[PDB]
Amino acid sequence: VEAGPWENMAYSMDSNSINNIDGYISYTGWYRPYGTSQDGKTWYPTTVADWRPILMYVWPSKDVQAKFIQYFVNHGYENSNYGLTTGSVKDLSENTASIKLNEVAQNLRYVIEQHIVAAKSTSQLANDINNFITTIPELSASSELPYGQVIFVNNDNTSYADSKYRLMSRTINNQTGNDNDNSDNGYEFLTGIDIDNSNPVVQAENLNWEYFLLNYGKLMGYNPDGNFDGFRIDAADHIDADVLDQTGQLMDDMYHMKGNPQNANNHLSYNEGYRSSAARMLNKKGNPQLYMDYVGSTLGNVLGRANNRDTISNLVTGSIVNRQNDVTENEATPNWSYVTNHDSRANLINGLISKDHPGAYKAEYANQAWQEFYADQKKTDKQYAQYNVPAQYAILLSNKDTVPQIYYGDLYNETAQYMQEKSIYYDAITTLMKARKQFVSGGQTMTKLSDNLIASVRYGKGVTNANSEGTDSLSRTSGMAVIVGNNPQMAEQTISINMGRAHANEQYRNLLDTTDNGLTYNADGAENPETLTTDDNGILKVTVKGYSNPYVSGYLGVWVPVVSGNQDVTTNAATVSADSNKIFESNAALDSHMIYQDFSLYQPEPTSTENHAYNTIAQNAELFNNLGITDFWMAPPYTQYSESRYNDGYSVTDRYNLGTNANPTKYGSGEELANAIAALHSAGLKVQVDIVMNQMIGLPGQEAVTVTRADNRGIQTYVNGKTYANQMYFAYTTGGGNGQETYGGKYLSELQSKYPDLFTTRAISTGVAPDPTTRITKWSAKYENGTSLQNIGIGLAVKLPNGEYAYLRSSDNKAFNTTLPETMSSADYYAN
C-alpha cells in the first residue's frame, strides 16, 4: 500500500506539522497530513503550505462527528457519487456504527478536497469550519458561560501552571480568610488576568517593583533625581492585603517613617477603595496608607444633583470623619477625599453614551457625548453635568482631617491637548486652593442654619475650638468661613456665623460670593461688601439668598481674614511621633497636604513631543506649587495593551518599561518622566506613582490551563443553571515584555542585603514570608488567580476516546509521552 488513507497521518509528529499549545491539540487547530485525495484512488503529497483543519479528521464524540457530516453535506458539500446527500446522512447519529461514520467521514474528506481544488484555497473551508463550530454548544465560545471569569486550578495535565497559593479574596479584613464581619470587604476579580498576590514569589516581585519605582531615574541612568516618593495603590479593595502590609514595611525600612511624621508625610501613600471597611482595616494596621473617603458621593447627592437633593446636614455626618464639631487631633482615620476622579467622570460620560448610541456597543466613536457635556457644563439648567462644582470644592478644601485630591478635568478641559484649555471652574477652584494654603487650619465646626444652608468654619492655625485663644502668631489672621446652600429658591435673609473668640472685632475679606450670572472675587454683583467686621464675640453677620446660574444653584460664600500680604498656615510635621506604632496620623501636618490627580481617561494622545504630558508638567512645575499642590498623583506610566479603549495605563503589558523616545506611552517617555519628577521636586512637591498590582490585561502568549467557572470572589458559580470545573482552556496568560525579563527580581538580592526582615516577616494571609529565591522574568498562569472570560471556549482540548488528553512532545514540552489520535498518527490503525 504505497498510496492510500494512511497518508492522513501527520507529515511529521512535531510542531512543524501539528498545531499545539504546550503540547495540547485544539479542535480549532490545523495540521499538515502527509498526503491528500479527492477521490480515494489518487493520493498526492502535501507541500509545507497544505494544512487542513483537525475537525475534518477528529471530533470530541460520535455525536459531533455525525453533526459535522450532516452540517457539511447540508452547507455545500453534497455529492451523490460518494454516498453524501441530504438524505443519505439524515439519520446518522452517535448510535451509528463507528466504522460506518469513519467511512462516511472519509468520503466527505474527498468531497472537501474537491471543493478546495475548485476554489484553489482553504478559505471557504476555514469559514465553514468556524460556522460549524458555533452551532455546537460544547465547541463554541458560548461554552465558557458569559459573563464573568474563570479561576486557574491545579491539574497534572497543566502541571507547570500548578500553585499551592491562589488564596482568593483575602481582601481588606478577610486577610486570614474567615469573613465574620457582616460588612462589604471586596472580592478578588475585576477584569483581565488577575495576579495572585497571595503567592510569596509574587509578593517578593511587588517589593522589587516598588523599589524600582522609588529609585526610577537613578536605576535607569536618567535624571538622578526624579524618583517616585510614594504610591497611589490601584484596586486596593481587590488584592491580597498582604501587599499593603509589605508596601508599608518596605517604605518604613527604606525611609524610617514609624519614628518621624516628617519622613512619613514626605513619602505619602494612599489606597483607592469604595468600601468603608477599609478604614477599620487600615486603623488596625497603624495606617500605612491613607483610606479613600466617600464624601465625594455625599457632595454629589447633596450639592450636585438637579432635583431630589439630600439635606445639607449630610455634609456633617456623611463621611469617615464627623465634622459637626471636629476639634481634636490624631483621632480621625487618616484619609484622602475628592470632588471628582477619573472614574467618576467616566461613569458620567459612559451613561450619556447609553442615550447617544442606545444600548449599542461602545467601541467606536462618541466625542459627541463630550460636545454635549461641555455645552451642558456651561448651562444654568444642567441635564447631565454636576451642579455647584465650586461649592463642592469649597467644602472639600476647607474640611479638617483629610488630604483633599483635586481632579485635572475640573481645572482643564480634559479632552483638549494636555493643559491647553482651562475649564470654566479654573478660576473658582484655584482661588479656593490658594486660600487653603493661606488660611485653613484649626478646628472645624459645621453649623446648620435653615435646613438648606450650612456654615463650615475653620478657626485658624493654633485655634483648636470656638473658645480657644491662639497659640501661633498667625492664629489671629487665619481661619475661614464657607457658606453653602443647595436651595436655588432660598429666601433672602441675614445669618450669624461664629468665627471663634480668637477673631473678635476683626475685619474679614469677601473672598468669593455669588452674583446673578456667576461668582465674584471682589464683591461686585453680591449681597455683601468687600469687607465685613466681626462683633465683640467674633460673630460675623452675612446676607444670603438662593441663586440660579451655571456656577451656583443655591449659594456659595467664602470669608477669610484681611492680611498684610503672603501667609502660609502649613504645619510642619514632627520628627518624633505621638504614638510611634502609627505611620500616618490625621493632624494639622497631614492636613497641610493636597493631592492632584494629573490625568483623565479621556485625555488625548499627544500630537507632538511638546504636547507630551510629562513635558507640559516639567514646564508648569512652579504653577502646581503656586496653587498649593504638594502631592502629585501621576497616571500609571506603564506600557499599554495596544487595543485598550482609553490607552490610560491600567491595561498593562510591561510593568518596567515606562516609555521610550521611539515608543512613548500616552504621557511620554521614561527620560521625560524622570525630568518631570525632578522638575516637580525642584518646585517643592512630592510625587507618587499609580501602582497596579491587581491585573495585567493583554498578554500575547497562549498557555494551556485547567480552569473552573467562578464568580467575582473566585468561588465556583452557576450561570443560567450551568457551570464547569477542571476544564482545559487555551487562555492568553504569558508575557511581561523585555522590562520584566531585564528588571524582574533584579533588586531582590540588594533588598535581602539591606532589609532582610522583608523576607523573614510572615505574611498574614499565608503565614510565610515573601520568597526572594525565584525571580519573575515572565508572567504565566502559575502566578495568576485566573482571567475574565476571553471568548475562546472550554471544549476545544482534544481528548482521545480512552479519556486522556492528546499530547505532543516538542523540546519545551516533555510532561507526557506523545499520544495523538489514531486518525492522524497510527500506522497500525491504517494497516486494518
Ligand X SMILES: C[C@H]1O[C@H](O[C@H]2[C@H](O)[C@@H](O)[C@@H](O[C@H]3[C@H](O)[C@@H](O)[C@H](O)O[C@@H]3CO)O[C@@H]2CO)[C@H](O)[C@@H](O)[C@@H]1N[C@H]1C=C(CO)[C@@H](O)[C@H](O)[C@H]1O
Which triple of cell numbers denotes residue 556? Answer: 456659595
HSE (side-chain half, CA atoms, 13 Å) at 755:
22
438 binds, among Ca ion, ligand X, none (CB under 5 to 8 A by kind): none
191 binds, among ligand X, Ca ion, none (CB under 5 to 8 A by kind): ligand X
Minimum CB distance to Ca ion smaller for 188 or for 210: 188
Minimum CB distance to ligand X smaller for 274 or for 718: 274
Q: Does 267 bind Ca ion (CB under 5 A)?
A: no
User: Residue 762 gets which letter from DSSP?
Assistant: P
188 binds, among ligand X, Ca ion, none (CB under 5 to 8 A by kind): Ca ion
Which triple of cell numbers denotes residue 678? Answer: 525632578
Backbone angles phi, psi at 738, to 5 degrees: -70, -25
**Residues contacting 515, CB < 8 A, separation 6+:** 524, 525, 526, 547, 549
Q: Does 644 bind ligand X (CB under 6 A)?
A: no
Site for ligand X in 526-565 (CB under 6 A): none
Return the beta strands (E) in 202-348 as ranges: 230-233, 270-271, 291-292, 325-326, 335-338
DSSP-based three-state secondary structure for 85: coil
703 binds, among ligand X, Ca ion, none (CB under 5 to 8 A by kind): none
Site for ligand X in 195-234 (CB under 6 A): 234
Query: Within the chain, how many helices (H) and strands (E) appear?
Result: 22, 31
Q: Does 15 bind ligand X (CB under 6 A)?
A: no
Instruction: Look at residues 295, 276, 261 and name the one whose alpha carbon lies nearest to residue 585.
Output: 261
* Cα 116–chain centre separation: 48
Shortest Å distance, C-beta 618 to ligand X: 25
Residues in binding contact with Ca ion, number by CB under 5 A: 5
* Orientation of helix 242-255 relative to helix 200-214, angle to 10°: 40
Minimum CB distance to ligand X smaller for 29 or for 300: 300
Distance CA 678, CA 670 (A): 12
Minimum CB distance to ligand X smaller for 235 or for 397: 235
Shortest Å distance, C-beta 165 to Ca ion: 13
Which triple of cell numbers denotes residue 421? Answer: 484649555
234 binds, among ligand X, Ca ion, none (CB under 5 to 8 A by kind): ligand X
DSSP-based three-state secondary structure for 615: helix
194 binds, among ligand X, Ca ion, none (CB under 5 to 8 A by kind): Ca ion
Shortest Å distance, C-beta 714 to Ca ion: 9
Burial tier of 351 (Cβ tally within 10 Å: 0-12, 13-18, 19+) = exposed
Given 190, 613, 693, 728, the residue binding ligand X (CB under 6 A): 190
Minimum CB distance to ligand X smaller for 691 or for 794: 691
Residue 755's alpha-carbon distances to 262, 267, 429, 759, 764, in angstroms, are 21, 18, 44, 8, 19
Residue 90's alpha-carbon distances to 67, 100, 133, in angstroms, are 10, 14, 19
Q: Does 592 bind Ca ion (CB under 5 A)?
A: no
Instruction: Look at residues 373, 365, 371, 367 and name the one whose alpha carbon lies nearest to residue 348.
Output: 373
Given 108, 129, 136, 235, the residue binding ligand X (CB under 6 A): 235
Minimum CB distance to ligand X smaller for 59 or for 602: 602
Minimum CB distance to ligand X smaller for 582 or for 713: 713
297 binds, among ligand X, Ca ion, none (CB under 5 to 8 A by kind): ligand X
Instruction: Look at residues 71, 72, 26, 34 and name the one whose alpha carbon lies nearest to residue 53.
Output: 26
Shortest Å distance, C-beta 344 to ligand X: 7
Minimum CB distance to Ca ion smaller for 298 or for 787: 787
Distance CA 286, CA 280 (A): 10
Residue 587's alpha-carbon distances to 285, 594, 649, 815, in angstroms, are 18, 13, 33, 59
Instruction: Look at residues 616, 620, 613, 722 and name the one whose alpha carbon lies nearest to residue 658.
Output: 613
Whether residue 508 is preceded by a cis peptide bond, meaning omega within 30 degrees of 0, is: no
Minimum CB distance to ligand X smaller for 292 or for 573: 292
Q: Does 713 bind Ca ion (CB under 5 A)?
A: no
Q: Does 694 bind Ca ion (CB under 5 A)?
A: yes
Shortest Å distance, C-beta 235 to ligand X: 4
Q: What angle do CA 62, 67, 68 make, to 5 degrees?
A: 95
Residues in binding contact with ligand X, number by CB under 6 A: 13
The reply, when asked if residue 188 is annotated as ligand binding, is yes
Element (H, E) at 133: helix 123-135
Shortest Å distance, C-beta 238 to ligand X: 6
Distance CA 655, CA 234 (A): 14
Q: Does 183 bind ligand X (CB under 6 A)?
A: no
Shortest Å distance, C-beta 341 to ligand X: 7
The reply, when asked if residue 694 is annotated as ligand binding, is yes
Given 274, 365, 521, 718, the residue binding ligand X (CB under 6 A): 274
DSSP-based three-state secondary structure for 674: helix
Q: Does 272 bind ligand X (CB under 6 A)?
A: yes
Given 650, 724, 747, 779, the residue binding ligand X (CB under 6 A): 650
272 binds, among ligand X, Ca ion, none (CB under 5 to 8 A by kind): ligand X
Q: Does 297 bind ligand X (CB under 6 A)?
A: yes
Shortest Å distance, C-beta 319 to ligand X: 12
Element (H, E) at 616: helix 613-619
CB 737 within 8 A of CB 639: yes
Site string for ligand X, 736-765 (x = CB under 6 A): ------------------------------
Distance CA 198, CA 431 (A): 46
Site string for Ca ion, 213-252 (x = CB under 5 A): -------------------------xx-------------
Neighbours of 3 (CB within 10 A): 13
Given 85, 88, 96, 191, the residue binding ligand X (CB under 6 A): 191
Q: Does 237 bind ligand X (CB under 6 A)?
A: yes
Site string for ligand X, 335-354 (x = CB under 6 A): -------xx---x-------
The reply, when asked if residue 612 is annotated as ligand binding, is no
Binding range to ligand X, per CB under 6 A, among 235-243, 442-450, 759-767, 779-787:
235-243
Minimum CB distance to Ca ion smaller for 240 or for 585: 240
810 binds, among Ca ion, ligand X, none (CB under 5 to 8 A by kind): none
Q: Which residue pairs, CB below 8 angstroms and at least 24 apart, start in 527-536? A: 527/492, 528/557, 531/507, 531/562, 532/507, 532/508, 532/559, 533/505, 533/506, 533/507, 533/508, 534/499, 534/503, 534/504, 534/505, 534/506, 534/508, 535/504, 535/505, 536/504, 536/505
Minimum CB distance to ligand X smaller for 693 or for 710: 693
Backbone angles phi, psi at 231, to 5 degrees: -140, 135
Distance CA 586, CA 440 (A): 15
Return the beta strands (E) in 599-747 as ranges: 631-634, 639-640, 652-654, 686-691, 695-696, 701-710, 727-734
Backbone angles phi, psi at 785, to 5 degrees: -75, -35
326 binds, among Ca ion, ligand X, none (CB under 5 to 8 A by kind): none
Q: Does 244 bind ligand X (CB under 6 A)?
A: no
Site string for Ca ion, 171-210 (x = CB under 5 A): -----------------x-----x----------------
- Binding residues for Ca(2+), as ranges, are 188, 194, 238, 694
The contact set with Ca ion (CB under 5 A) reads: 188, 194, 238-239, 694
- Binding residues, as ranges, are 188, 194, 238, 694
The contact set with ligand X (CB under 6 A) reads: 190-191, 234-235, 237-238, 272, 274, 297, 342-343, 347, 650
